[PDB]
């Protein structure tokens, strides 16, 4: 299948309570493999997956150095952003960054990403061409001008096409037992009466990986999109994910409803019914 590597930075200011906190996590697909927290007793990039632990001291020294440099740069960016938005130094604010690469089955670059936000809103983003920028407002346009003048996009492009893809390929090989294994959902339908003339049918999906899944209800073969209650996909805590979808049906019509499940770990889509 295709695969992705993503790094996520969060920098959060807290006036009166020290310097901004910087946290960074790294993922391959839906598997976290490293973390960094500036509030830790002794901040270091640290392993969160067994297949990364084999990297040597030069690796961990390198990544730790990067995260301290990044913490410093985004602390300064919080101070800069304050001025760009004419804001007081009393409040707490947040910068977020997500970046990385996607590769196809053959391991070549599908596309790269480098996107930033301020207080939960888009700030600036590297365009898919990896050579121009999209700025969300006149503040981000000031940053865009600086980055254009310094040819920043060229350096990100070189990273995204080169080191990002090369490292992702290495991780996929070292973690092939798990990163390259899809676990299909375990599925069942439950039935619970609401009243004498209505019942809830809930379609469960359990123990699947990766997180991407489609659960749909049909009535007489017609999708019940606007009438289905769909809960957010949630982590089980053991690498896998869980989801359910529910529909309220008239008593006696339960067999007119079917649940359809799509997942990477399934050769063909599943169709389930309530089995009384």
């Amino acid at each position: 299948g295709s695969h992705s590597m993503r790094y996520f930075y969060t920098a959060m200011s807290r006036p009166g309570r020290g310097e901004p906190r910087f946290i960074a996590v790294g993922y391959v697909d839906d598997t976290q493999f490293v973390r960094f927290d500036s509030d830790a007793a002794s901040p270091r990039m640290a392993p969160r997956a067994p297949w990364i632990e084999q990297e040597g001291p030069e690796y961990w020294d390198g990544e730790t150095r990067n995260m301290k440099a990044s913490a410093q740069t985004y602390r300064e960016n919080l101070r800069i952003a304050l001025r760009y938005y004419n804001q007081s130094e009393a409040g707490s604010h947040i910068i977020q960054v997500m970046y990385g690469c996607d590769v196809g089955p053959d391991g070549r670059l599908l596309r790269g990403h480098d996107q930033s936000a301020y207080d939960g809103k888009d700030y600036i983003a590297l365009n898919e061409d990896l050579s121009s920028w999209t700025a969300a407002d006149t503040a981000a346009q000031i940053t865009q001008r600086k980055w254009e003048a310094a040819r920043v996009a060229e350096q990100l492009r070189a990273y995204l096409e080169g080191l990002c893809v090369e490292w992702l390929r290495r991780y996929l090989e070292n973690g092939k037992e798990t990163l390259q294994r899809a676990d299909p959902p375990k599925t069942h339908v439950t039935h619970h009466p609401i009243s004498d003339h209505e019942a809830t049918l809930r379609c469960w999906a359990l123990g699947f990986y990766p997180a991407e899944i489609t659960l749909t209800w049909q009535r007489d073969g017609e999708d019940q999109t606007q009438d289905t209650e769909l809960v957010e996909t949630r982590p089980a805590g053991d690498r896998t994910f869980q989801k359910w979808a529910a529909v309220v049906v008239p008593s006696g019509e339960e067999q007119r409803y079917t649940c359809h499940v799509q997942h990477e770990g399934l050769p063909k889509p599943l169709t389930l019914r309530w089995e009384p």
């Binding site: 790094y7 960074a24 790294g26 690796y59 390198g62 990544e63 990067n66 995260m67 440099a69 990044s70 740069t73 300064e76 960016n77 800069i80 952003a81 760009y84 970046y99 000031i142 940053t143 600086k146 980055w147 310094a150 920043v152 350096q155 990100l156 990273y159 080191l163 490292w167």
Partner: peptide, 12 residues
């Protein structure tokens, strides 16, 4: 490195 190294160029 695996993370992007030259982060100083990303001054706002």
């Amino acid at each position: 490195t695996s993370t992007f190294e030259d982060v100083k160029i990303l001054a706002f």
